[PDB]
Amino acid sequence: MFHTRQLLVFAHSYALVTLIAEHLADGALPPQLLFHYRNLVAVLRLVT
Amino acid sequence: DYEETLRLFKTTVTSPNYPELCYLVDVLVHGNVDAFLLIRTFVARCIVNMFHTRQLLVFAHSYALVTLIAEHLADGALPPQLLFHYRNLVAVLRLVT
């Protein structure tokens, strides 16, 4: 989806974003795609 | 100017996906020079793979490993940019002292 439509998906839900940031970091995704979700979690931490 | 290296360092140490065996190698070497020298190729492959697949440089959590990488792993055997990041860590240490 990122390659084709230039948008990251599963961003509509907290649970999927957190799970992707945690469990999908060992590889799989290119590092930038992971870093976007990681930055979203970081934004939540900053607001906290 | 060392801001780039410090930003990479902060990214690494804050990252929750820091690989575990970095702790294992660190606790196994004790910072013993001969022990590290035995495991050169392993740690070099680790740092290169972890940098390419993840935006972080490993073994940054340990002073002994950082200094050993900066000193011994400089004679080729590693892409220059990562070696310079470790050099900049050591140079920051010298500047603050």
Swiss-Prot record, chain A:
Protein's UniProt name: Major capsid protein
Biological role stated in the UniProt entry: Self-assembles to form an icosahedral capsid with a T=16 symmetry, about 200 nm in diameter, and consisting of 150 hexons and 12 pentons (total of 162 capsomers). Hexons form the edges and faces of the capsid and are each composed of six MCP molecules. In contrast, one penton is found at each of the 12 vertices. Eleven of the pentons are MCP pentamers, while the last vertex is occupied by the portal complex.
Subunit structure of this chain's protein: Homomultimer. Makes the hexons and eleven out of twelve pentons. Interacts with triplex proteins 1/TRX1 and 2/TRX2; adjacent capsomers are linked together in groups of three by triplexes, heterotrimeric complexes composed of one molecule of TRX1 and two molecules of TRX2. Interacts with scaffold protein; this interaction allows efficient MCP transport to the host nucleus. Interacts with capsid vertex component 2/CVC2. Interacts with the small capsomere-interacting protein/SCP.
Localization: Virion; Host nucleus
Boundaries of the shown chain within the full protein: 638 to 685 of 1370
Similarity annotation: Belongs to the herpesviridae major capsid protein family.
Source organism of the structure: Human cytomegalovirus (strain AD169)
Domain of life: Viruses
Curated annotation (Swiss-Prot), chain B:
Top-level lineage group: Viruses
Signal sequence annotation: none
Annotated TM spans: none
Compartment(s) of residence: Virion; Host nucleus
Described function: Self-assembles to form an icosahedral capsid with a T=16 symmetry, about 200 nm in diameter, and consisting of 150 hexons and 12 pentons (total of 162 capsomers). Hexons form the edges and faces of the capsid and are each composed of six MCP molecules. In contrast, one penton is found at each of the 12 vertices. Eleven of the pentons are MCP pentamers, while the last vertex is occupied by the portal complex.
The family this protein is said to belong to: Belongs to the herpesviridae major capsid protein family.
Subunit and partners: Homomultimer. Makes the hexons and eleven out of twelve pentons. Interacts with triplex proteins 1/TRX1 and 2/TRX2; adjacent capsomers are linked together in groups of three by triplexes, heterotrimeric complexes composed of one molecule of TRX1 and two molecules of TRX2. Interacts with scaffold protein; this interaction allows efficient MCP transport to the host nucleus. Interacts with capsid vertex component 2/CVC2. Interacts with the small capsomere-interacting protein/SCP.
Protein known as: Major capsid protein
Stretch of the intact protein here: 589 to 685 of 1370
